[PDB]
Design a protein around this ligand. Structure first.
Ligand SMILES: [Zn+2]
Lengths: 133, 120
């Protein structure tokens, strides 16, 4: 299971075993067309603590895209209960307009909270921006 | 009605069970509740609770709202193994105010009119 990210074909990197804090690798393409990655973990402070997902792996991925003018990104996280409902419903607001970001939970993720998803999701950013707290 | 917390999902049929359920604090003196009538989870009330305080979200397709209390951050827990989240102190509402909100959502299946809301 590899995923397209511009010209590159990327499959899941090895990740820590999940212990209650989500960990993930974000991949993106810089202005030169080169491949870059960042590691994010959940639980930190954030500039938008009013959004429950801002400090998540996928939320930091989204806010990094906003702050760096990135338009296409791919994130792998290790949470076995999938991508949460906060992220399903708020991630296009953090994303800058029209930016595309694909979130890949671990294989065989099984959600336990309604609204959460165990499937890969492709968010494309909408026009609204985070409100400041 | 579907009701999710740290320990999993049960179905709630009347308000008194709901009120008992929202009092559960299985770990870190905390809980994370998801109340929904839909199999897809939308609309939902999504509640973070710790000690006698809470933060309440209401979510629907194209709709995102958070409770408005009276500011730094306050740490809540998302799961039983201790995954943490930092939330706005501006959104922290009383544990009681949260019960009244959950009561209204149970009877109306729509955004509770009790709390003050900010739209996200
Ligand atoms: Zn999330």
């Amino acid at each position: 299971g590899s995923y397209a990210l511009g010209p590159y074909q990327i499959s899941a990197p090895q990740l820590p075993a999940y212990n209650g804090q989500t960990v993930g690798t974000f991949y993106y393409v810089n202005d030169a067309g080169g491949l870059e990655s960042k590691v994010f973990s959940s639980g930190g402070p954030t500039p938008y603590p009013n959004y429950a997902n801002a400090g998540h792996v996928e939320g930091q991925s989204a806010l990094f895209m906003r702050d760096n003018g990135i338009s296409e990104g791919l994130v792998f996280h290790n949470n076995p209960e999938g991508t949460c409902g906060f992220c399903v419903n708020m991630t296009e607001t953090l994303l800058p307009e029209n930016a595309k970001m694909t979130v890949v939970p671990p294989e065989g993720a099984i959600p336990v909270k309604r609204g959460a998803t165990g499937e890969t999701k492709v968010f494309t950013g909408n026009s609204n921006s985070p409100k400041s707290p | 009605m579907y009701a999710d917390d740290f320990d999993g999902e049960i179905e709630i049929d009347e308000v008194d069970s709901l009120v008992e359920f929202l009092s559960r604090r299985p770990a870190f003196d905390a809980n994370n509740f998801v109340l929904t009538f839909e199999e897809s989870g939308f609309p939902q009330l999504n509640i973070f609770a710790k000690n006698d305080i809470a933060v309440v979200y209401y979510m629907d397709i194209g709709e995102n709202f958070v409770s408005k209390g009276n500011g730094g951050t306050e740490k809540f827990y998302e799961n039983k193994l201790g995954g943490e989240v930092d939330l706005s102190k501006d959104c922290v509402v009383s544990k009681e105010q949260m019960i009244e909100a959950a009561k209204q959502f149970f009877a109306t299946k729509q955004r509770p009119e009790q709390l003050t809301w900010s739209e996200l």
